[PDB]
Amino acid sequence: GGDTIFGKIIRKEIPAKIIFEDDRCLAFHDISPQAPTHFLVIPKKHISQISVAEDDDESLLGHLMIVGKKCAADLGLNKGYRMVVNEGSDGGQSVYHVNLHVLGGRQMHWPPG
């Protein structure tokens, strides 16, 4: 679903440790985890970044968050976690395919970067 490494993951062309899939999104462990649990939830629709998401995408974006919180519960994150979406250079976005980070299993600190 797109012209990035995450499109290749969606198409199963390169491996990832997949946590959950449905017809419109995919959740998988981050290859460079920043916490004991660190996974991504991505749409299969290639939205390059949250700044270009459309109004009609609202329920899809909320679906990523609902999938994210369900996966976090399944992975035992009962003490809490942090969800992150990066936009652009200042946001530290590393792949131009919208992706929701879910980090847990340790105390997350403030500020969030």
Strand ranges across the sheet with 25-29: 18-21, 25-29, 37-43, 100-104
Q: Find the shortest distance in angstroms from Cβ 72 to Cl ion.
A: 16
The closest alpha carbon to 41, from 94, 100, 104, belongs to 100
Q: For residue 106, what are the CA distances in angstroms to 3, 26, 30?
A: 33, 24, 16
Nearer to a copy of itself, 13 or 90 (CB): 90
Per CB under 8 A, contacts with a copy of itself among 32-61 are 34-35, 50-51, 53, 55, 57-61
# residues contacting Cl ion (CB under 5 A): 3
Binding footprint of a copy of itself on the chain (CB under 8 A): 34-35, 50-51, 53, 55, 57-63, 65-66, 68-69, 72-73, 77, 79-93, 101, 103-113
